[PDB]
Amino acid sequence: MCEVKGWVPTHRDLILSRRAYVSCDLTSCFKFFIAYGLSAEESLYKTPIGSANTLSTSEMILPGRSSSACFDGLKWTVLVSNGRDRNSFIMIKYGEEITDTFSASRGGPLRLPNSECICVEGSCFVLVSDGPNVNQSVHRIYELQNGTVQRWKQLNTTGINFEYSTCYTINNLIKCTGTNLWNDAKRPLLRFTKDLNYQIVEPCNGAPTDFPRGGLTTPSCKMAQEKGEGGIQGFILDEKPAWTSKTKTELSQNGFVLEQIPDGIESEGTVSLSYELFSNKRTGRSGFFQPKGECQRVCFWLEIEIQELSTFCGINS
Ligand SMILES: *[C@@H]1O[C@H](CO[C@@H]2O[C@@H](C)[C@@H](O)[C@@H](O)[C@@H]2O)[C@@H](O[C@@H]2O[C@H](CO)[C@@H](O)[C@H](O)[C@H]2NC(C)=O)[C@H](O[C@H]2O[C@@H](C)[C@@H](O)[C@@H](O)[C@@H]2O)[C@H]1NC(C)=O
Ligand SMILES: *[C@@H]1O[C@H](CO)[C@@H](O)[C@H](O)[C@H]1NC(C)=O
Ligand SMILES: *[C@@H]1O[C@H](CO)[C@@H](O)[C@H](O)[C@H]1NC(C)=O
Ligand SMILES: [Ca+2]
């Protein structure tokens, strides 16, 4: 059908930025990011993908410290979190209007994933996390329409933590990669549908892809507990073939390696093809985005160190 058989690069008064990601409308793609100062408060800004982030090129959206954004074919849905603890909240804008809010249920802070949310046939889906401790975190999928919350589903994530969710959609399934900041150096995976049925699975190989992490181990569908605490946003293309991604080694954030696994992420993890990128550059967060115009496209963004996003897109059938 539409196997991803490789990846190619597609993009290579300054505002200081963190938690950036990419999202696209029908013609163009944007960097959404949290601006926290000037190369001489915290607010979601947006900039055309070809430009540097600067007061002249970047557009302020709303105050906040995490975010998500997605285009539904008609208008932008944007979410930001702000406030603290039990008074932490998320606000949502649809086009130019603020359309909804909700507050923390489990002690806060409310946290958005800092990757694009996923719109399918006018509904948009976003993962929201809550809870003050990574060892007792709560995660919900919120379904939106026109920037208004229609419903949500809290997930059973007992025994894991699922932060920094980065998601894509193929064939009206939505698939997200999580970062476990508590007790796993492998990345938890989420699969869900427009009806909010879902499955959470663990990679069954022996090569953890979080940073920090331990060394390689025997393949199994067990969690990789060694150096499981902490983590950084990243992605796994959860298809057949699957593709994993990680720093070159567990000792350094240099480099970025992509590995193709034809039998999928729940198999023993035999690699058929690998890439090595950015060999002597420090790399950071990574996540999915999907441009909008046969097979559905999938791309990824990656922080590189002065710290900028590069983007790569998948080549299909
Ligand atoms: C809530 O989920 C937990 C853990 O489920 C496992 O990890 C999840 C993140 C997800 O990936 C699931 O697909 C995984 O199974 C589950 O507890 C686990 O249940 C399995 C058996 O179904 C056990 O083998 C496993 O030891 C257990 N893990 C832990 C950490 O407790 C919960 O289901 C269950 O509660 C436990 C205490 C058992 O009594 C079990 O019979 C009961 O169904 C699940 N809670 C609910 C209400 O479904
Ligand atoms: C959860 O982690 C926190 C932070 O380190 C710790 O204070 C607490 O004891 C842990 N709680 C449980 C249930 O183990
Ligand atoms: C969303 O706006 C559309 C216009 O595209 C309208 O037809 C629809 O009823 C709205 N849906 C909700 C849930 O408000
Ligand atoms: Ca981890």
In contact, 281 and 305? CB cutoff 8 Å: yes
Distance separating alpha carbons of residues 70 and 264, to the nearest angstrom: 28
225 Cβ contact list (under 8 Å, min separation 6)? 183, 184, 185
Pairing status of strand 15-24 against strand 173-179 = unpaired
301 CB-contact burial (10 Å; exposed 0-12 / middle 13-18 / buried 19+) = buried
* Alpha helix stretches (DSSP H) within the chain: none
129 Cβ contact list (under 8 Å, min separation 6)? 110, 111, 113, 137, 138, 139, 140, 162, 163, 165
Between the CA of 6 and the centroid of ligand 2 the distance, in Å, is: 42
In contact, 54 and 15? CB cutoff 8 Å: yes
Q: How far is CA 57 from the centre of its chain?
A: 24
Q: Residues within 5 Å of ion ligand 4 by Cβ?
A: 180, 210, 228, 231
Distance separating alpha carbons of residues 50 and 2, to the nearest angstrom: 28
- Strand ranges (DSSP E) for 133-239? 138-145, 148-154, 163-170, 173-179, 189-193, 198-201
Nearest-ligand number for the alpha carbon of 97: 3
Going by the DSSP 8-state scheme, the letter that residue 111 receives in this structure is B
Residue 170: how many other CB atoms lie within 10 Å: 18
Query: Under CATH, what is the fold of the domain 1-317?
Result: Neuraminidase (2.120.10)
Distance separating alpha carbons of residues 55 and 71, to the nearest angstrom: 23
Nearest-ligand number for the alpha carbon of 213: 4
189 Cβ contact list (under 8 Å, min separation 6)? 175, 176, 177, 178, 200, 201, 202, 203, 236, 238, 265
In contact, 164 and 178? CB cutoff 8 Å: yes
Between the CA of 264 and the centroid of ligand 1 the distance, in Å, is: 23
Mutate to test the pocket of ligand 3, among 144, 145, 148 (most ligand atoms within 8 A of CB): 145
Pairing status of strand 15-24 against strand 198-201 = unpaired
Give the torsion sign (CA, 129, 152, 141, 48).
negative
Question: Which two three-digit tokens encode residue 84?
Answer: 């603290």
Going by the DSSP 8-state scheme, the letter that residue 251 receives in this structure is T
Q: How was this structure determined?
A: X-ray
Query: What b/e sequence results for 222-251 when a residue is b if at least 16 CB atoms lie within 10 Å of its CB, and e otherwise?
Result: ebbeebbbebbbbbbbbbebbbbbbbbebe
Residue nearest to atom 4 of ligand 3 (CA): 146
Between the CA of 132 and the centroid of ligand 2 the distance, in Å, is: 10
Q: For residue 301, give the 3-state DSSP assignment.
A: strand
Q: For residue 136, give the 3-state DSSP assignment.
A: helix
Distance separating alpha carbons of residues 262 and 257, to the nearest angstrom: 16
Peptide bond connecting 241 to the previous residue in cis, omega within 30 degrees of 0? yes
Question: Which two three-digit tokens encode residue 122?
Answer: 């006018």
Report the candidate in 234, 147, 146 with the shortest Cα–Cα distance to residue 187. 234
Between the CA of 123 and the centroid of ligand 1 the distance, in Å, is: 30
Nearest-ligand number for the alpha carbon of 190: 1
